PDB file of C-alpha atoms and ligand atoms in Angstrom:
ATOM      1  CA  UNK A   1       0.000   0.000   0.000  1.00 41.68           C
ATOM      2  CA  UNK A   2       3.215   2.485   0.868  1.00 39.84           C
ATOM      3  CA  UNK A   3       4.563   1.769  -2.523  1.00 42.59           C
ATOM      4  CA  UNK A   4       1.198   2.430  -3.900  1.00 41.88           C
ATOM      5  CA  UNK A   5       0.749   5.804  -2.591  1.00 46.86           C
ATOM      6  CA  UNK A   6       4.355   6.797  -3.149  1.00 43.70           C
ATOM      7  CA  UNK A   7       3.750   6.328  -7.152  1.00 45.25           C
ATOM      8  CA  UNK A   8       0.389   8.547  -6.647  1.00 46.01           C
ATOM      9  CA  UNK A   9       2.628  11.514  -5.113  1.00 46.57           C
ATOM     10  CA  UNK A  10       4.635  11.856  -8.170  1.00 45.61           C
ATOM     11  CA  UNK A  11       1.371  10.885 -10.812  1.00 47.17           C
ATOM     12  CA  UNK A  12      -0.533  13.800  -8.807  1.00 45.36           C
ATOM     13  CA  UNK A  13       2.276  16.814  -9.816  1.00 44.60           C
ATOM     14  CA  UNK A  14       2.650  15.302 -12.996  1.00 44.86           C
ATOM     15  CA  UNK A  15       6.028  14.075 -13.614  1.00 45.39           C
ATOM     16  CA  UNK A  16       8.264  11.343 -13.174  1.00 44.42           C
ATOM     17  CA  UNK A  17      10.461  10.317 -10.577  1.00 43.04           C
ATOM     18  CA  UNK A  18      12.004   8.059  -8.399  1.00 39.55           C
ATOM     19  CA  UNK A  19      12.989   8.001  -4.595  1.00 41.14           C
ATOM     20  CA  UNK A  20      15.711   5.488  -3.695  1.00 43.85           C
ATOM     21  CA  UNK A  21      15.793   4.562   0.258  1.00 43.05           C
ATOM     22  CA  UNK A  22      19.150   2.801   1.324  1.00 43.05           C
ATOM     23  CA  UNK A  23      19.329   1.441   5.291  1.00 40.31           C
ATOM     24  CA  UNK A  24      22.513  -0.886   6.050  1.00 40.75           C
ATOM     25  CA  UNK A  25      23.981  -2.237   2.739  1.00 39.49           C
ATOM     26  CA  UNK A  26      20.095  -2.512   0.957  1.00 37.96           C
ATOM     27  CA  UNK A  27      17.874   0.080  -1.548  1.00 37.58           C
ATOM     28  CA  UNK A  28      14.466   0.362  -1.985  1.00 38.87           C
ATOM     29  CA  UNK A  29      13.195   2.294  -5.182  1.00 39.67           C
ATOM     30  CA  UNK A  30       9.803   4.094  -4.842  1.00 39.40           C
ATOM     31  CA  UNK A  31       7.730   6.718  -7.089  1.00 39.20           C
ATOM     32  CA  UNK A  32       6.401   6.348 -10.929  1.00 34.34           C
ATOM     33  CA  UNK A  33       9.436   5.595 -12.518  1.00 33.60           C
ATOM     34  CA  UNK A  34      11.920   3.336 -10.795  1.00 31.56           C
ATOM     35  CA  UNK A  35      13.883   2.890 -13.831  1.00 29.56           C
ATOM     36  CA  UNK A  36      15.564   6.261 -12.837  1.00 31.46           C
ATOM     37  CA  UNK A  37      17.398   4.597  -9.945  1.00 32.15           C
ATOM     38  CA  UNK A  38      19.971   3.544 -12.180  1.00 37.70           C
ATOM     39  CA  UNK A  39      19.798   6.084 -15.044  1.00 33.04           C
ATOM     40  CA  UNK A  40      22.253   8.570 -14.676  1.00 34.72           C
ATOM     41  CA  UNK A  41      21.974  12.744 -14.632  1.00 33.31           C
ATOM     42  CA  UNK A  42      24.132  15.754 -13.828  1.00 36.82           C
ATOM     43  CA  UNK A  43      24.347  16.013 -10.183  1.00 34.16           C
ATOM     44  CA  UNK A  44      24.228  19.945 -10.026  1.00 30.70           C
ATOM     45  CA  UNK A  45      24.058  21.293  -6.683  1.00 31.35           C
ATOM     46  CA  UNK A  46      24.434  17.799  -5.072  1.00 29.12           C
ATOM     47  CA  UNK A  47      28.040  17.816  -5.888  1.00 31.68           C
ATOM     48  CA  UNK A  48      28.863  20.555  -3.492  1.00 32.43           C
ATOM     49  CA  UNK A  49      28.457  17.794  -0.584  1.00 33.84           C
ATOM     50  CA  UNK A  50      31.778  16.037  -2.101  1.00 33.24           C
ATOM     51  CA  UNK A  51      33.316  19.500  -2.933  1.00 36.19           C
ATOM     52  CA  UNK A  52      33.193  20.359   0.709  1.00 33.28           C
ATOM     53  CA  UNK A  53      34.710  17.247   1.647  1.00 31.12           C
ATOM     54  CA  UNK A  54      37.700  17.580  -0.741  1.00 27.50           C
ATOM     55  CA  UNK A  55      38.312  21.560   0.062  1.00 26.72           C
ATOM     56  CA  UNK A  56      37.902  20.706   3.716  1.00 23.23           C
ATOM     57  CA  UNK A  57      40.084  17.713   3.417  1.00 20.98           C
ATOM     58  CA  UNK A  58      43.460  19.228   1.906  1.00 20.57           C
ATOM     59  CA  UNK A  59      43.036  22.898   3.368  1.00 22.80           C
ATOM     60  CA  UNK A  60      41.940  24.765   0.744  1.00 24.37           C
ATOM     61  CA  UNK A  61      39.290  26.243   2.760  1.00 21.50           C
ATOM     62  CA  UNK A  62      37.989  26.817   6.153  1.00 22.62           C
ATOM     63  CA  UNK A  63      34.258  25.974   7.688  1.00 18.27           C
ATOM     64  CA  UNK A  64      34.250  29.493   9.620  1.00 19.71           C
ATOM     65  CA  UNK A  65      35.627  31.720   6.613  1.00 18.27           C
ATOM     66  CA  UNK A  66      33.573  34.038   5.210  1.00 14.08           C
ATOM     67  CA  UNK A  67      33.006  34.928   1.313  1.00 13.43           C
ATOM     68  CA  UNK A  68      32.073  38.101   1.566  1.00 12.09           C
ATOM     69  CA  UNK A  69      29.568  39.011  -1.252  1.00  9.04           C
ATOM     70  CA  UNK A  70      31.281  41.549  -3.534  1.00 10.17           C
ATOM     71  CA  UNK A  71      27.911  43.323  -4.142  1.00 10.16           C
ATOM     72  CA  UNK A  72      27.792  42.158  -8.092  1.00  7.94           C
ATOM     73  CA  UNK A  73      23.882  40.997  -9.004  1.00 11.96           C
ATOM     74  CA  UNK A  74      24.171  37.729  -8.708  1.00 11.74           C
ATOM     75  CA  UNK A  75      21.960  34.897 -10.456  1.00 12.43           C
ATOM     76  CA  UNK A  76      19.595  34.260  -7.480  1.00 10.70           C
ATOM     77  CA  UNK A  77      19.109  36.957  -4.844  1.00  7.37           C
ATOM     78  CA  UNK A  78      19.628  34.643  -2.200  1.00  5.84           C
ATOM     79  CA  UNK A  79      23.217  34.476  -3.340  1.00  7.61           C
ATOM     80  CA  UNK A  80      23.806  37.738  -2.372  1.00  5.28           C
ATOM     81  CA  UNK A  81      24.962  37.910   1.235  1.00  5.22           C
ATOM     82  CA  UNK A  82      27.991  36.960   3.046  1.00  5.01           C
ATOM     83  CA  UNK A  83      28.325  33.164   3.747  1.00  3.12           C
ATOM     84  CA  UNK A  84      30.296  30.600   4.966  1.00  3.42           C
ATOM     85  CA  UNK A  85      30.595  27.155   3.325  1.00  4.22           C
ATOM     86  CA  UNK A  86      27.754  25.763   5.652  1.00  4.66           C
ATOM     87  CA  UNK A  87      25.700  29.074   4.620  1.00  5.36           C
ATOM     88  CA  UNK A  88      26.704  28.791   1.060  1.00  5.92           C
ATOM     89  CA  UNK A  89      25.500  24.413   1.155  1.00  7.06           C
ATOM     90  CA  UNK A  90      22.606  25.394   2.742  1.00  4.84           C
ATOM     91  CA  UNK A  91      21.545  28.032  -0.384  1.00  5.14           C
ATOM     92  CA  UNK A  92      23.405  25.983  -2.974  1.00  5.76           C
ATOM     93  CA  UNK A  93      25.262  29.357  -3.658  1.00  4.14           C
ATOM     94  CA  UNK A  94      27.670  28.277  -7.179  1.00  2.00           C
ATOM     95  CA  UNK A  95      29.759  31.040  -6.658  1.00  2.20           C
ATOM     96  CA  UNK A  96      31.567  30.059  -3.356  1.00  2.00           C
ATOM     97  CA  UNK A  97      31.377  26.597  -4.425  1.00  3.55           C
ATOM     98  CA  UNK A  98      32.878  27.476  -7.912  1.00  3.77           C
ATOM     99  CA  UNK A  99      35.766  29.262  -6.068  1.00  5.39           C
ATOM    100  CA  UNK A 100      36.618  26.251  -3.629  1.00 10.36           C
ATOM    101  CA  UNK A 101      36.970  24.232  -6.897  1.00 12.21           C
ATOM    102  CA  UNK A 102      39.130  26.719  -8.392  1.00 14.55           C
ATOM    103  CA  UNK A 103      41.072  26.715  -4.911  1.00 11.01           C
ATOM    104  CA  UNK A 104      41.225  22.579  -4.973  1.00 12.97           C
ATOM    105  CA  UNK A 105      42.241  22.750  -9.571  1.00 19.04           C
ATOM    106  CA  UNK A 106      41.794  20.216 -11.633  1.00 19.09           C
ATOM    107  CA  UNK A 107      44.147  17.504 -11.075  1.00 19.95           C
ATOM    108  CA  UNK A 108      43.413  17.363  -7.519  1.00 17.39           C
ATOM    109  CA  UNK A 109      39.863  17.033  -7.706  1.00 18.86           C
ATOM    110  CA  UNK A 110      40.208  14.488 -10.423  1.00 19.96           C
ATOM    111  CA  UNK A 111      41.988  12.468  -8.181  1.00 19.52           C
ATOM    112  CA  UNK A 112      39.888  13.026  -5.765  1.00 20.44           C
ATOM    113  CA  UNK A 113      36.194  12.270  -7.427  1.00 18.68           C
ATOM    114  CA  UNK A 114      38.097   9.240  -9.422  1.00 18.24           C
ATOM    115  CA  UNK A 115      39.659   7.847  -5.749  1.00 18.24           C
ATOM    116  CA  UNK A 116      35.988   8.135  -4.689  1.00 21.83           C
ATOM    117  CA  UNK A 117      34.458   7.114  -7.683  1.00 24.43           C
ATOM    118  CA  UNK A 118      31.433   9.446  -7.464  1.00 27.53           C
ATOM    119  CA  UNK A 119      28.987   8.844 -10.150  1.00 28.36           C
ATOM    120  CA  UNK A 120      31.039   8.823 -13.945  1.00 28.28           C
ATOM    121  CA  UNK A 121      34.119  10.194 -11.980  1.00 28.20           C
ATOM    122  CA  UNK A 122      34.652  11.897 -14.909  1.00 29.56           C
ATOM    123  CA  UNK A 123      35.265  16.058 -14.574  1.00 28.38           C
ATOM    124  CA  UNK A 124      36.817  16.754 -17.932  1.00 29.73           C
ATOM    125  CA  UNK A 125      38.914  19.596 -18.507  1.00 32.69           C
ATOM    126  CA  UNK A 126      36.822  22.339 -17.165  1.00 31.63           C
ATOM    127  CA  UNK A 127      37.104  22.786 -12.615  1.00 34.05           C
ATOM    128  CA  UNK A 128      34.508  25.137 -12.770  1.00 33.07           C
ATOM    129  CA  UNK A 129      31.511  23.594 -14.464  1.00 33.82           C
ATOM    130  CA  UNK A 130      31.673  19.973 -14.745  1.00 34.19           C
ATOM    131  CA  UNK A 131      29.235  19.214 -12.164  1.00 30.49           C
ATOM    132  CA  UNK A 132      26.655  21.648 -13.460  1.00 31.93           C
ATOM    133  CA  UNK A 133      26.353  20.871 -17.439  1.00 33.63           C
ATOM    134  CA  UNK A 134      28.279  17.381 -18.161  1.00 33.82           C
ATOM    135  CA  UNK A 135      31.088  15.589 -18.384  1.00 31.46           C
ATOM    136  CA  UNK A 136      30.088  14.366 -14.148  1.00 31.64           C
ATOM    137  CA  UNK A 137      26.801  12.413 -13.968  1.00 30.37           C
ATOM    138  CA  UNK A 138      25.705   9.946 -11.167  1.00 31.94           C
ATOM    139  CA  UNK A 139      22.637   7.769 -10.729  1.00 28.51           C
ATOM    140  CA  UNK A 140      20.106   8.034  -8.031  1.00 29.03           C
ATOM    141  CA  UNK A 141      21.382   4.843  -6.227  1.00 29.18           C
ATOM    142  CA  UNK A 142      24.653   5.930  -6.280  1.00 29.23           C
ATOM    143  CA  UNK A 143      23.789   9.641  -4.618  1.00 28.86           C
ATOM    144  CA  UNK A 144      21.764   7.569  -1.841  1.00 29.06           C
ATOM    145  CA  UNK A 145      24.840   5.656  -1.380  1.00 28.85           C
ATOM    146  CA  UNK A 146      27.447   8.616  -1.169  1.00 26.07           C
ATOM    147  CA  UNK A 147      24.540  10.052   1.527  1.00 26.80           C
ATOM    148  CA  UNK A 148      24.194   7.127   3.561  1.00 28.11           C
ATOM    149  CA  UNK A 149      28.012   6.583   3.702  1.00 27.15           C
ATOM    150  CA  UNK A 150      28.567  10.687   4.560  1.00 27.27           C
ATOM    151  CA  UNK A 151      25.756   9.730   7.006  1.00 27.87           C
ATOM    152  CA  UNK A 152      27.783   6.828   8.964  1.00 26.04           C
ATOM    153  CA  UNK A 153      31.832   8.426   8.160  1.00 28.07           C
ATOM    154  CA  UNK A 154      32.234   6.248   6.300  1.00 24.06           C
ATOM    155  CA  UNK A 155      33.360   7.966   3.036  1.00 24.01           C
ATOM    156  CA  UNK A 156      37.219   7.413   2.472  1.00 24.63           C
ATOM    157  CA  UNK A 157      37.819  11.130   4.649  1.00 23.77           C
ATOM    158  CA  UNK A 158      38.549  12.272   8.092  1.00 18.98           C
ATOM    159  CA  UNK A 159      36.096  11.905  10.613  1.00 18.54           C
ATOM    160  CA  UNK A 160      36.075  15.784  11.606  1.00 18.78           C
ATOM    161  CA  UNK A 161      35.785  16.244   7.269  1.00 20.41           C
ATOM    162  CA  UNK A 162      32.549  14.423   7.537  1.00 18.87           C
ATOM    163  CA  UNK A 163      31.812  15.546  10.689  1.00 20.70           C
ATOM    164  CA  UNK A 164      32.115  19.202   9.420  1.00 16.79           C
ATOM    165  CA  UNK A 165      29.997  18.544   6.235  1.00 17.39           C
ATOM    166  CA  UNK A 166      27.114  17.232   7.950  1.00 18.97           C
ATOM    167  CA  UNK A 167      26.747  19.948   9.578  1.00 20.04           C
ATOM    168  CA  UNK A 168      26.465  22.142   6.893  1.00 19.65           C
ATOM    169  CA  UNK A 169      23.490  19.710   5.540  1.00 17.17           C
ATOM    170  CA  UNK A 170      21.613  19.969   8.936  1.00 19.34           C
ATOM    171  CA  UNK A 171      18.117  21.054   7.987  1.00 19.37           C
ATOM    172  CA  UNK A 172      16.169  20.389  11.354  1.00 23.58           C
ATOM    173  CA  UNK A 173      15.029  18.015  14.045  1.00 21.08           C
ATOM    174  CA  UNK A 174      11.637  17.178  13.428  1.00 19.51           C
ATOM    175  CA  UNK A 175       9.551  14.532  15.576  1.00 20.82           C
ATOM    176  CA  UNK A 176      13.007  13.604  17.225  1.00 19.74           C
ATOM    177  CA  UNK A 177      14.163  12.745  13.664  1.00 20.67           C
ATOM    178  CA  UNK A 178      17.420  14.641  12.406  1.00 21.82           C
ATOM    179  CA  UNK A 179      16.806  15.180   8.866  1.00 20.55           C
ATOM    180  CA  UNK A 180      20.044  16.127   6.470  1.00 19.66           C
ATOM    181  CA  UNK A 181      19.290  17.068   2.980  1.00 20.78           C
ATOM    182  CA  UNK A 182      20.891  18.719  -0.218  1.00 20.68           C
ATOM    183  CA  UNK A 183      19.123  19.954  -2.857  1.00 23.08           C
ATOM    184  CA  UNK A 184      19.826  20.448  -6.343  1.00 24.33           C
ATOM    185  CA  UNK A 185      18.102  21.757  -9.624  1.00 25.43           C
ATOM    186  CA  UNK A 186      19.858  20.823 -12.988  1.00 27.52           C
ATOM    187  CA  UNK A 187      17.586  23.545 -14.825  1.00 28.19           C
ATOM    188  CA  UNK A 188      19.783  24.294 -18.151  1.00 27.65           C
ATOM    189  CA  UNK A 189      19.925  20.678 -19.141  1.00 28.37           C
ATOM    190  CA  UNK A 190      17.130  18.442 -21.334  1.00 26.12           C
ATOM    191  CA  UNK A 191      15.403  17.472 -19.867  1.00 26.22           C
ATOM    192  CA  UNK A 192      15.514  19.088 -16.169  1.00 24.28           C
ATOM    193  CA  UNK A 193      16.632  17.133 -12.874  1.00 23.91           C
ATOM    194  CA  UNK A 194      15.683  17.706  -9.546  1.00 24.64           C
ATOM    195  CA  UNK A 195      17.303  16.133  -6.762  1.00 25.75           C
ATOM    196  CA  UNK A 196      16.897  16.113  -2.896  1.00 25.82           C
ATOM    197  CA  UNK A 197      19.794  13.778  -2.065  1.00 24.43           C
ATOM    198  CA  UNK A 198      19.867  13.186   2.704  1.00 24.93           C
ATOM    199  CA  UNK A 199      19.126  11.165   5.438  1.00 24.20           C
ATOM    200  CA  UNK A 200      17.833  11.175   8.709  1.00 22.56           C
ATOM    201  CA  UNK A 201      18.728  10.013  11.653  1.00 20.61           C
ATOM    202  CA  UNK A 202      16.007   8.353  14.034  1.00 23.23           C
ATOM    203  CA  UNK A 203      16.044   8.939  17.722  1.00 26.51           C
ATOM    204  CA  UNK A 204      16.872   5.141  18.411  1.00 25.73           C
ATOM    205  CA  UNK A 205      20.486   5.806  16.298  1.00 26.79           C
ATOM    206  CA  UNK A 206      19.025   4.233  12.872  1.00 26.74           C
ATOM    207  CA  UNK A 207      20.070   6.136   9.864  1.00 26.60           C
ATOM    208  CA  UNK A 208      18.127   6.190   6.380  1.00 26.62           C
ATOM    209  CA  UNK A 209      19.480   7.341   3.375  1.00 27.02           C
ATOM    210  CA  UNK A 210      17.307   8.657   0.753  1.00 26.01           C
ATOM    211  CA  UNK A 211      17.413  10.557  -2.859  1.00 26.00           C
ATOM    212  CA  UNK A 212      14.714  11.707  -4.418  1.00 24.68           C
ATOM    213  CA  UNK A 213      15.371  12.522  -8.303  1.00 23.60           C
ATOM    214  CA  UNK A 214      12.946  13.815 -10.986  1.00 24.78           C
ATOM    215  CA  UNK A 215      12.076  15.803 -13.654  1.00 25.64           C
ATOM    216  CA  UNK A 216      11.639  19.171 -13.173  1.00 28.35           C
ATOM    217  CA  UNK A 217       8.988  21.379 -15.837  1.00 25.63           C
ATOM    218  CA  UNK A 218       7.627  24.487 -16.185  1.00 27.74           C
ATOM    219  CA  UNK A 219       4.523  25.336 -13.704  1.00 26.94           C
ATOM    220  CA  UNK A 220       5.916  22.641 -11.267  1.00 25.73           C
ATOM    221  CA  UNK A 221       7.422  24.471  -8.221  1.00 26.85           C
ATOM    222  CA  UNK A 222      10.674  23.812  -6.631  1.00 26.34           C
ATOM    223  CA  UNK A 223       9.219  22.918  -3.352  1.00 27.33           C
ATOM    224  CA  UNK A 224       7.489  19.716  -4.532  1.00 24.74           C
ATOM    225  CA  UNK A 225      10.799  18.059  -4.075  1.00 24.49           C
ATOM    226  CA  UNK A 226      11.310  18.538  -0.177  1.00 23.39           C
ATOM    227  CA  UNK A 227       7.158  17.739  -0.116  1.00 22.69           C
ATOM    228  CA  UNK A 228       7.418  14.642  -2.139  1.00 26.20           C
ATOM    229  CA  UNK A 229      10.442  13.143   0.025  1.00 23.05           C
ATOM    230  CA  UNK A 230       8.997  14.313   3.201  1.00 22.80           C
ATOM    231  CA  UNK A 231       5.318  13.017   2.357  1.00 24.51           C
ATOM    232  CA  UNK A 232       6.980   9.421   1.260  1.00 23.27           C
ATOM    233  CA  UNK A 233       9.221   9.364   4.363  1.00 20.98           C
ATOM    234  CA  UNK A 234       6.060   9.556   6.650  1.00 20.21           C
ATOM    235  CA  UNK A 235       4.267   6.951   4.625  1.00 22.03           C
ATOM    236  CA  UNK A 236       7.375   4.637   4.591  1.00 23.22           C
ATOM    237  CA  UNK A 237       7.634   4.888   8.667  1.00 26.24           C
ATOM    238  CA  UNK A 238      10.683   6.847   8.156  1.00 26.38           C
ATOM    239  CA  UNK A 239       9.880  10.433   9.346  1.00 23.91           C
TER     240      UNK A 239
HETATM  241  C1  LIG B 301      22.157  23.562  -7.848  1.00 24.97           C
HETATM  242  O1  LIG B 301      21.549  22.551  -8.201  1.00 24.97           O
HETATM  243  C2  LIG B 301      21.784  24.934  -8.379  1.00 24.97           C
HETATM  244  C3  LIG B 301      20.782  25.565  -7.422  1.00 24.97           C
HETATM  245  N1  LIG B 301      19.898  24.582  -6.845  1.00 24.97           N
HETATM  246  C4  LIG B 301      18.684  25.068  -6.600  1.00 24.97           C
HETATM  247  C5  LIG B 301      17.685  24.267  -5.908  1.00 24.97           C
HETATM  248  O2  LIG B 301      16.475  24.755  -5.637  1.00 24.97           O
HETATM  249  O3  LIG B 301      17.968  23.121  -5.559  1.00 24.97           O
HETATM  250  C6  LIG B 301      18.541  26.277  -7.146  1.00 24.97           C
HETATM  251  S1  LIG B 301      17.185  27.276  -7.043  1.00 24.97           S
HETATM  252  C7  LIG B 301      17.786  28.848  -6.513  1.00 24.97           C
HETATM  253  C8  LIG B 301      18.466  28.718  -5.158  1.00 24.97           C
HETATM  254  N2  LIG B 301      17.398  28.928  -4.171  1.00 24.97           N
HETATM  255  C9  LIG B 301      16.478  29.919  -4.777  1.00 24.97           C
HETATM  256  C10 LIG B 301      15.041  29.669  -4.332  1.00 24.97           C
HETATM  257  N3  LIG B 301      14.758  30.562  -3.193  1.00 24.97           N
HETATM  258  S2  LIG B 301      14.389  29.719  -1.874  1.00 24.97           S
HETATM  259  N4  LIG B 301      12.931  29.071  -2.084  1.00 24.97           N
HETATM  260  O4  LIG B 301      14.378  30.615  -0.754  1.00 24.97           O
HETATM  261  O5  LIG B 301      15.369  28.692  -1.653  1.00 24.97           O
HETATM  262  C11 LIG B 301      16.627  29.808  -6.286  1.00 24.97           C
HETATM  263  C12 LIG B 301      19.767  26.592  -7.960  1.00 24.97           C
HETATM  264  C13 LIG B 301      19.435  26.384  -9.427  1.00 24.97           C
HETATM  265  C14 LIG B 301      23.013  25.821  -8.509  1.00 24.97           C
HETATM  266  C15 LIG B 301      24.113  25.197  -9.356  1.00 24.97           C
HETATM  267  O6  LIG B 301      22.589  27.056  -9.101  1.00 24.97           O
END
């Protein structure tokens, strides 16, 4: 019956999409097309999680630094304030992300993402863009997986690394639950992905990985992604 009602939350906004759910080493697929679980995408935004870890990792950047907006219109208005890294996950801001890759360069962070192996681990000539518009895509499974590893420290990092990226996805504590979450919106690609790639973390200690990926169109608002995932969660037990 879950599953059932899961596929109706995607049919009713009209679109397709899937929402993997990974708990120990096992995934469930849910939603009206499963078949995305393994098809893969750009990750956009999502990549910032494993950006973090790399600029955090080999010092090119600081979780308490501050890029200070340089008062030049940005693309989104939310993008223009001062922020942290945590501040700048939190709004998916490109710009402070774009400089930390530009800070790690290109041979590092193709070490890195191969060493990794997130998604295609492949990042092409370009540090500044190759998360946003091709060569890097990932599936669905595979962004559940690099969440519920990040989730348990167990990506191939420091502990204080992961420790320090978490908190930077920290969304809020809701029913006891912890709920981390990045979101991302692949918008100038054909077709459009959304993603909402987390976990939470139950008040017993259980942690459940989940990403939620699907096509984004015209006239269907961003915020059906955090209501689709958060809507499944509570029918799945989850949240
Ligand atoms: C990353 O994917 C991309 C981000 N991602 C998102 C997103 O919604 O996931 C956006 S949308 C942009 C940022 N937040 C603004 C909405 N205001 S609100 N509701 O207060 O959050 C608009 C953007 C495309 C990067 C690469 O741009």
């Amino acid at each position: 019956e879950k599953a059932e009602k899961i596929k109706n939350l995607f049919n009713e906004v009209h679109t397709t999409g899937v929402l993997v759910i990974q708990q120990g080493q096992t995934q469930q697929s849910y939603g009206n097309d499963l078949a995305r679980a393994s098809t893969e995408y750009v990750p956009a935004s999502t990549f910032d999680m494993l950006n973090a870890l790399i600029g955090l990792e080999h010092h090119k950047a600081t979780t308490t630094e501050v890029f200070k907006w340089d008062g030049q219109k940005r693309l989104f208005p939310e993008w223009e304030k001062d922020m942290t890294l945590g501040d700048a996950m939190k709004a998916s801001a490109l710009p402070v992300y774009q400089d930390l890759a530009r800070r790690i360069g290109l041979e590092l962070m193709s070490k890195e993402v191969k060493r990794v192996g997130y998604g295609n681990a492949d990042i092409g000539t370009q540090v500044d863009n190759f998360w946003l518009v091709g060569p890097l895509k990932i599936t669905p499974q595979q962004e559940a997986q690099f969440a519920y590893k990040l989730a348990n420290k167990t990506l191939p990092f420091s502990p204080k690394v992961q420790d320090e990226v978490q908190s930077m996805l920290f969304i809020e504590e809701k029913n006891g639950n912890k709920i981390y979450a990045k979101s991302g919106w692949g918008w100038d690609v054909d077709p459009q992905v959304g993603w909402l790639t987390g976990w939470v973390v139950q008040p017993q200690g259980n942690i459940v990985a989940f990403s939620l990926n699907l096509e984004m169109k015209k006239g269907i608002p961003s915020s059906v992604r955090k209501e689709i995932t958060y809507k499944s969660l509570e029918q799945l037990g989850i949240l």
